[PDB]
Amino acid sequence: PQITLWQRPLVTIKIGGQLKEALLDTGADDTVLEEMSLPGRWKPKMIGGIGGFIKVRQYDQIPIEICGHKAIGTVLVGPTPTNVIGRNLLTQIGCTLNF
Amino acid sequence: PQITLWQRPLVTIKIGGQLKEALLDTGADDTVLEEMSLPGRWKPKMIGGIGGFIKVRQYDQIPIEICGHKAIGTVLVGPTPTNVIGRNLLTQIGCTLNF
Numbered sequence A, B: 001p002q003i004t005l006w007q008r009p010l011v012t013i014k015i016g017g018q019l020k021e022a023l024l025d026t027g028a029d030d031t032v033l034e035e036m037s038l039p040g041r042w043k044p045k046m047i048g049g050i051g052g053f054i055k056v057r058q059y060d061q062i063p064i065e066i067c068g069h070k071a072i073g074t075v076l077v078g079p080t081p082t083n084v085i086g087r088n089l090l091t092q093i094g095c096t097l098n099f
């Protein structure tokens, strides 16, 4: 698709068999989702946002579908104001910025 | 142009007579820049992102140039860790996400 930016670029994602809404954020290096259960072991990561730093749980090699496009990558879980899809998965689905 | 998302999508902006580097952020509601002087009236604002909120000054009807494309809009100025161009100016230069 081509998505304009007059409204928030909110899309539907599917992870762990569940649908969620998430924001396509090209200012984000990483993908961060609100609290949820995922399989496997996790590693610690401290990430910084506009308000400061948070601790999150890092899960690697997680399947996730974004607007129907299949990706498999790193997902961070923790106290975020909204689910954000960052460049690590934007690049997997072939996203670019055009103007 | 077409901008790849393998790296952070940084561009040069011209604003208030100054040249600055800033991140094109499709998930950002607002444009927020590190401390700098701008002309005219302002009002304070709290803005939230990962890690919580910071207090900024809001200046409206500010001219800006982004990769050679002129626009005008609201610019927020405060202790942001990094300069972000949000959707309020990205729309004006005809920036879309495509995949």
Ligand SMILES: COC(=O)N[C@H](C(=O)NN(CCC[C@@]1(O)Cc2ccc(cc2)C/C=C\CNC(=O)[C@H](C(C)(C)C)NC1=O)Cc1ccc(Br)cc1)C(C)(C)C
Residues within 6 Å of the ligand: A023, A025, A027, A028, A029, A030, A031, A032, A047, A048, A049, A050, A081, A082, A084, A086, B025, B027, B028, B029, B030, B031, B032, B047, B048, B049, B050, B081, B082, B084, B086
């Ligand atoms: C390299 O570090 C990062 O990539 N950090 C990201 C990040 O915060 N990116 N920022 C870009 C903006 C992300 C976001 O768009 C996510 C984000 C999108 C949308 C919401 C909240 C957060 C929804 C709620 C309110 C609206 N708030 C926003 O739009 C705010 C605002 C424009 C006001 C700063 N937007 C954002 O906070 C830039 C940045 C880079 C380095 C550091 Br240290 C700190 C910040 C993530 C924490 C999301 C992974």
Ligand SMILES: [Cl-]
Residues within 6 Å of the ligand: A072, A073, A074, A088, A089
């Ligand atoms: Cl990844």
Ligand SMILES: [Cl-]
Residues within 6 Å of the ligand: B072, B073, B074, B088, B089
């Ligand atoms: Cl505006």
Ligand SMILES: [Cl-]
Residues within 6 Å of the ligand: A004, B094
């Ligand atoms: Cl348009």
